[PDB]
Amino acid sequence: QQDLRKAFRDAVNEFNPTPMNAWTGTINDVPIAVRRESLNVKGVDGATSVFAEAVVSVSHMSSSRFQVSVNVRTVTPFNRMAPFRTIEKTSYTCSSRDCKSRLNCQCNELLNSFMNQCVASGGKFVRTPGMCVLDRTCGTCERTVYLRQLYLVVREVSNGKYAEDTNLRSAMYAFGDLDNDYQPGIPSTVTVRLYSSKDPYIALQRLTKGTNDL
């Protein structure tokens, strides 16, 4: 869609990265650092993100409610409750690469491996009734996954003044409370970023629905 490329260019063209130069301070007491990262969008050289970043401890976490206290100059202080864990549902489907022929099929092996990893994660494994052969879904796993990266968003309230964006909970599409990076296993730290709502990364995420293509 050629309108997408133009809409992205316009968003980049209008992005002023200089207010973030005033961003200093802490996230959960960890001093932030501001980074400039090229989005490497061809033909759009100004497509450069500018965000604050802090790697913060989560070794106190026992619950699902991770609290993130943002104390950055020119940003109104706010405390975000972020979901520390969520349920991931996956399935194992018997594919051609795992099933060279009907007589030499390895799908049962990889189903058993899927089951064992599910169980070792504390998940619920359910075997699908019927034989596990080509192009069938053979099992599901419902397991808990844990936050790795939290990209918060602030918006301009007045000139050179920012506040927590109550609409964009995350800079990652689809920008909601659970649109963060979750992975199996309990981490020791979480990487927290702070983006302006005008950041080209968010424009890119929005126009490509998180795919970052076009």
Numbering used by the authors: 41 to 254
The authors write:
TcSMP is a poorly characterized protein, reported to be involved in mammalian cell invasion, with an auxiliary role to gp82, the major adhesion protein of metacyclic trypomastigotes. It is highly conserved among different Trypanosoma spp., making it an ideal candidate for CD diagnosis. To date, the function of TcSMP remains to be elucidated; however, knock-out studies carried out on a homologous antigen (43.7% sequence identity) from T. brucei (procyclic-specific surface antigen-2; TbPSSA) underlined the importance of the protein for parasite transmission. In this context, we describe the production and high-resolution (1.62 Å) crystal structure determination of a surface membrane protein from T. cruzi (TcSMP) as a potential serodiagnostic antigen for structure-based in silico epitope mapping and design.
